[PDB]
């Protein structure tokens, strides 16, 4: 498996996030650390929210995936989910269709 | 790894397509077999085109992914590619960001 492929990328991510969780011993220290890099009020998303998202995506990566504009940064979990789900749905659909092609050929050449 | 997860789905697909390729001994027999299930002229996409697409997606699944309206059926390769690439891009981005969170915590608590 090549170094630049999605699957290698998946467990590099999983390794980094697991390391992140070993290191971040007192996660409440991340509350109130701004995302912007120190317009953002009290009560908005911060570094702890982000840390949480990272962990949350990692939980899905680890389960093999079972179904200003830092506001784009937090849409990432939703986007990720959209992508991984539609991959799942495409391959599932195509797996069935490939079976139908195999059956059709067998039929055509009188194997059944 | 659970039976319904993307990764299990990936090599079920790969197994079915590899079986499809063993079975489809004379692929030119698929030319001129209509996709619609026997408005479609001569020169449009047929079962052989579809078979080709299936193989082509399988080549990407096997490389771990390195970067009427049957017309929707053929957009599937492009859609698949869009999805798998943006997954790759999200995890790569987030892998870097998780590293930055780890560094930040170490900094904050004076480990470096």
Curated annotation (Swiss-Prot), chains A, B:
Subcellular location: Nucleus; Cytoplasm
Gene ablation phenotype (knockout): Decreased lipid synthesis in the lactating mammary gland. Milk has reduced triglyceride content, causing reduced weight gain in nursing pups. Adults exhibit reduced body fat content. No effect on lipid synthesis in liver. No effect on the expression of thyroid hormone-induced lipogenic genes.
GO BP annotations listed: lipid metabolic process; regulation of lipid biosynthetic process; regulation of triglyceride biosynthetic process; response to bacterium
Example of a GO MF term: identical protein binding
Gene Ontology CC: cytosol; nucleoplasm; protein-containing complex
Tissue specificity field: Mainly expressed in tissues that synthesize triglycerides.
Keywords: Cytoplasm, Lipid biosynthesis, Lipid metabolism, Nucleus, Phosphoprotein, Transcription, Transcription regulation
InterPro entries referenced in this protein's UniProt entry, alphabetically: Lipogen_MT_Stabilize_sf, Spot_14
Function according to Swiss-Prot or TrEMBL: Plays a role in the regulation of lipogenesis, especially in lactating mammary gland. Important for the biosynthesis of triglycerides with medium-length fatty acid chains. May modulate lipogenesis by interacting with MID1IP1 and preventing its interaction with ACACA. May function as transcriptional coactivator. May modulate the transcription factor activity of THRB.
Entry similarity comment: Belongs to the SPOT14 family.
Known partners and oligomeric status: Homodimer. Heterodimer with MID1IP1. Interacts with THRB and PLAGL1.
Name listed for the protein in its UniProt record: Thyroid hormone-inducible hepatic protein
